[PDB]
Structure formats: structure tokens, C-alpha cells
Amino acid sequence: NLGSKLLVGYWHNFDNGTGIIKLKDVSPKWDVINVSFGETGGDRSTVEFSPVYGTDADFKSDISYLKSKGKKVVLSIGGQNGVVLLPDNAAKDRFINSIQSLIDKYGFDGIDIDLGSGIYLNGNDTNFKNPTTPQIVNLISAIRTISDHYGPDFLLSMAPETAYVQGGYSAYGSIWGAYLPIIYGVKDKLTYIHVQHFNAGSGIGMDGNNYNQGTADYEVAMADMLLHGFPVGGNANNIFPALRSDQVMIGLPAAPAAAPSGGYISPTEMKKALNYIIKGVPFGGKYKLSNQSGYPAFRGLMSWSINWDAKNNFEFSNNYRTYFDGL
């Protein structure tokens, strides 16, 4: 079903100046389309979604079309202007029910967790294998419940910011490391994770060195932490285990403007990072990969976004599709 080298692209269910792309006009180079976004109202727990164009039937039909072409269409929950709060079981149930309703209604292939607020590790929540914070416990539970409610081809992805994942190397509390229990809690159902390697400033690798976003070294350092695992919160006895290589992707801006706070990397530089991550071929960078000979099963690239890509001469899709096809 799903290929071993993927391009996952976010699709704007809204017009932010880059315009609307009808689903059938989405470049075939994208293997997975993350429809953005499912959003909540007053109760911050019931997720709603209405297509930006066409009737509900029309939209479902376009999705069915994409699916017939081998593409996956995923519902992304978030993001910048999305918020899900599950303080208790009642909220969790509204969340589960609303999501399942949407999946059925439109025929989504799965869900993408793209929540960048309302997620914190409470005081005393110190063990990523056994979280205690309601938001986190309930999210894990809801995700597992939803996943179990659908067949083997259900797709589960997530796009946390680096502080929530790799940031766990520095601290475990508040937002720092906060997605680690989520990842660990659903690892057996996780298709892949694509951390947002952008609007991130700098990041500390497993070598204790600081790297700047938008550089080949940074891309390798951040991905390697998921490919290899790493000690959490300065505790050598608290190691976050490696994910399967096929569960690891990297999230990138399709264009400089797609990440106004920085993060964009030129395909030329990114290919150096990819060749190092995948084939173990160095490029003279400062960061030394955990595995000398690479992680060939590395899953691919995610991008914000399909709409930005189309506005930027299809630079992202053309460059990386050709790269991965060439493997």
C-alpha cells in the first residue's frame, strides 16, 4: 500500500493568500495529503470539518478519486489555529466520536496529530512510558481507540514541533518532551512521525551540540534522535527508544515564506542530509551520524505545504520526488 519513500504534503482547507487548490489538481508527486485542518469550537473537544469548496458529497467524491489513484487522504487535527483540550473522559469521548464521524463521513484514510498548544507535562509527570497528565493520557487513549475502530490500512501520523520531541533531550516538563509519551504510547499504531524542522530556531543534538535550523547538520541531528533514541532530560538512565526507521520522516517548509521564522533549506543542501541519513554518506558536516552506514529505511519528507509548493515553482515536490525515485 504505502511506499517506502514518501512525500507527505499539507493541503490548505482555507485561503491564506496562496490560494485554493482543488483536490484533483493536487500534484501526483504527493503520496499522502494532509487535509488542514479539523478544528474545534467552544468546547475545544468536538472536532468539526467543512470542505472549503463543493458540497460534502463533492468533497468525499474527490477524496475517493485520490484514493483510487493510490493516494492517501488524511485529516489533520490542529494546527496553529486549532486546539483540542481533553481534561476528562467526557471531553475525550466527544473528541473520539467527532473524529470517527468525520472519518466515516468523508472517507479519510487516517488522522494526523498536529497540535501545537494545550499540551503540557504537569508537575510530577516524569515517566514517558507512564504519563499522568490528563491531556496526554486522554490523547493517547483517544488515538488508540480511533485507530482500533478502523482497518489495517488506517494511517496515523503526527507533526509536533521540536521542543515537544527532541527538546526532551534538554528538559522533561511543560512542553519540553511532551510528545514523547504520546509517541511511545501509540508507537505500535504510528505509521510515521514528521517533526516540524522549522520555525524552530536551534536544536541540541545527542552530541550535546547546538545546531541552527535550515542547515544540513541540523536536519541530520534532529532526525538521528528518533532513528537512534536518546537520553531524556539529562538522565542517562532514561533512554527514549529508537523508532523504526520507516516511522521517521522530516517536516520541511516548501518555500522560504512557508516558514516565516526560518527553517527552509535548499534542496541541494537537504540532499546532502538525506544522503547521510539514508546511505551513510557524509558531506563534511560537523554532526556525526549514530549509525556509520546510515538508516536506509528512513521514510521520507513532509512539507508545509502543497499550496506553498505550488506557489514556489513546485520546487519541493519536483526535487524530492526525483531524489527518492532515483534511489
Ligand SMILES: CC(=O)N[C@@H]1[C@@H](O)[C@H](O[C@@H]2O[C@H](CO)[C@@H](O[C@@H]3O[C@H](CO)[C@@H](O[C@@H]4O[C@H](CO)[C@@H](O)[C@H](O)[C@H]4NC(C)=O)[C@H](O)[C@H]3NC(C)=O)[C@H](O)[C@H]2NC(C)=O)[C@@H](CO)O[C@H]1O
Ligand atoms: C508552542 C508553540 O506553538 N511553539 C512556538 C510557535 O507558536 C511559534 O510560532 C508557530 O510556529 C509553528 C511552526 O512551528 C506554526 O505552525 C506551523 O507552521 C506553519 C507556518 O510556518 C503553519 O502555517 C499556518 O497555518 C495557519 C492555519 O493553522 C494559517 O492560518 C497560516 O496562514 C499558516 N502560515 C503560513 C505561513 O502558511 C502551520 O499551521 C504549522 N505547520 C504545520 C506543518 O502545521 C505557527 O503558525 C506559529 N505560530 C505563530 C505564533 O505564528 C514558533 C515560531 O515563532 O515558535 C515555537 O516555539
